[PDB]
């Protein structure tokens, strides 16, 4: 019901006797867990949020200068000084001016001039940063079974369960009802890195702008802008936004460089977005490794008789889904209402073999509704039977395309999530562990070399390494350079 809404969807199969499933949940994706002899469930991560986090720094994006004072002195006379050079929130500059008899100085030469102004920041032009606390960052994980009834995204499901995960949670039991219980027993250390995550926001929100941005600590702590802290009163580095023109006799024009919001936005391309509603600071790009326990799950509808075959009718006719599946919903015209649906399919001309891999394992029609059936069929011209209700079906695609798409999904998960991609659907093995170690080492090398380098320079460096290896006289150096260049090119695309 839920996974059909989101395009990014993964299927997990749990063979009979399986005790636990390991997942890497991620925002913007759904996971359907199909198990032998147990109901299928949808598990997804709804949001990551903290309430009332601490702030870090307040960069000023637009300044207003109030009062300007200029002091000049004659060449032979000493340097020019102001009381304002040693006051809080003042921006000053020292330079030299050409003096003479025209400027009423006794000698011709270069004088001393100092110009000062009062720095003040516009209230709505200010970039505020917030940081997350490991003990308080909360992960909300939702689980809904396959109840056999369809509800749109704007209709609430009474069988949906929510679990909020802080570091104080070991194992969460969700009473799915007649479908048993499901455990989650998963970790918060595998999520985002709070020590290197900053959620920047702008005070002005009605300017048609995102609420917040998901930044990195190093970039946010190295901006060439004035800064302070909320409880503090005196600004730091006030001369960034102010430029002083060349002196003219006894004058020095002070110029304001305008608003730097546009430059900041132009330099933020590619960063993930975030949200703020009231005091909750959400983020919309993240993941968390979570295990699912299928021990206590229970199949509803095994003691029931079988729905009559000659009493079905279409409510929605089957259609292609967004995930290579068939979705439908039937209606039943009988009084023996709580019963089981006889679904089956056959390729045209092979009527003795069923080819339907039901995702709703045991469909039921109940007094309160039911009838939503989702299946996956092999390519070709099939026939979908629900009792006496036939529906000729032609499934698109091919086996080779399916294998290629599965490989592409694996590669994309590897590119997005990273080393945790080896923890997805892992039942415990040696290949996964060695792959994870190799990927960790490779990622460490790649991040320590080209971590803060752009896409084009990385591609050019890879090509330069490839050329050096190709022209390399010594075979060993040639092989080393070709391998490193190919590795850099492969990692660069991700």
């Amino acid at each position: 019901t839920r996974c059909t809404h989101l395009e990014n969807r993964d299927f997990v199969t749990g063979v009979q006797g399986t005790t636990r499933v390991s997942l890497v949940l991620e925002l913007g994706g759904c996971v359907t867990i199909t198990a032998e002899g147990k109901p299928s469930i949808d598990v997804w991560l709804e949001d990551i949020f903290q309430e009332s986090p601490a702030e870090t720094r307040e960069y000023c994006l637009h300044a207003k200068l109030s009062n300007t004072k200029v002091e000049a002195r004659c060449p032979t006379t000493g340097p020019a000084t102001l009381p304002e050079e040693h006051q809080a929130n003042m921006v000053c500059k020292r330079d030299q001016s050409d003096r003479g008899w025209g400027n009423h100085c006794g000698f011709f030469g270069k004088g001393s001039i100092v110009a000062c102004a009062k720095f003040e920041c516009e209230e709505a032009k200010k970039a505020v940063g917030h940081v997350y606390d490991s003990t308080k960052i909360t992960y909300v994980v939702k689980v809904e079974p396959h109840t056999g009834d369809y509800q749109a995204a704007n209709e609430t499901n009474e069988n949906r369960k929510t679990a909020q995960f802080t570091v104080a949670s070991e194992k969460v039991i969700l009473d799915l009802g007649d479908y048993g219980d499901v455990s989650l027993t998963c970790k918060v250390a595998s999520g985002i890195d709070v020590a290197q995550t900053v959620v920047m926001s702008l005070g002005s929100s009605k300017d048609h702008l995102p609420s917040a941005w998901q930044l990195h600590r190093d970039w946010f702590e190295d901006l060439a802008l004035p800064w302070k802290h909320k409880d503090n009163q005196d600004w730091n580095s006030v001369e960034k936004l102010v430029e002083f023109g060349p002196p003219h006799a006894v004058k020095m024009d002070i110029f304001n460089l305008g608003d730097q919001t546009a430059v900041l936005l132009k330099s933020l391309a590619g960063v993930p977005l975030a949200s703020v509603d009231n005091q909750k600071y959400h983020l919309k790009s993240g993941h968390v490794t979570c295990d699912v326990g299928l021990e206590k799950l229970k199949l509803k509808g095994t003691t029931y008789s079988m729905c009559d075959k000659t009493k079905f009718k279409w409510k929605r006719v089957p259609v292609d889904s967004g995930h290579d599946t068939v979705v439908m919903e039937v209606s039943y015209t009988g009084s023996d209402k709580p019963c089981r649906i006889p679904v089956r399919a056959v390729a045209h001309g092979v009527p003795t073999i069923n080819v339907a891999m039901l995702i709703t394992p045991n469909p039921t029609i109940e007094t309160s509704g039911g009838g939503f059936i989702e299946m996956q069929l092999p390519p070709g011209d099939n026939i979908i039977y629900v009792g006496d209700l036939s529906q000729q079906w032609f499934q698109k695609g091919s086996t080779i395309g399916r294998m290629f798409e599965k490989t592409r999904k694996g590669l994309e998960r590897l590119s997005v999530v990273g080393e945790h991609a080896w923890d997805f659907g892992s039942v415990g093995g040696i290949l996964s562990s060695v792959g994870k170690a190799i990927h960790t080492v490779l990622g460490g090398a790649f991040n320590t070399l080209f971590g803060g380098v752009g896409f084009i320079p990385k591609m050019l460096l890879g090509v330069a390494l490839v050329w050096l290896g190709l022209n390399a006289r010594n075979p060993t150096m040639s092989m080393t350079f070709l391998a490193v260049g190919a590795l850099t090119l492969m990692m660069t695309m991700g």
Binding site: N8, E26, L27, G28, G29, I192, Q196, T197, P210, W213, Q214, L215, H216, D218, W219, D222, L223, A224, L225, K240, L241, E243, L257, Q260, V263, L264, L265, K266, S267, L268, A269, G270, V271, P272, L273, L283, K284, S285, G286, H287, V416, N447, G451, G452, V453, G454, F455, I456, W467
Partner: protein, 75 residues
């Protein structure tokens, strides 16, 4: 003026919405195209210079691309 380094760290990305994904490359392409369109005799002269003074295809291509890339940016 004010120099704000581009956010080159992509360690936080996910499946959520991103702020102007890939407009740095479009900005670079627009800058190079504009500079080429305003400077045509210069680019033709560079092309003819590399063509008749170099013997290796890679050398010609590298010289041309580096000139075109370093011209507009360091103006």
């Amino acid at each position: 003026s004010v120099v704000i380094p581009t956010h080159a760290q992509k360690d936080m990305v996910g499946r959520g919405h991103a702020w102007l994904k890939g407009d740095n490359i479009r900005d670079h392409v627009t800058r190079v195209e504009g500079w080429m369109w305003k400077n045509k005799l210069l680019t033709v002269a560079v092309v003819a210079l590399a063509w008749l003074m170099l013997d290796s295809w890679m050398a010609r291509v590298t010289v041309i691309l580096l000139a075109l890339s370093l011209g507009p940016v360091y103006a």
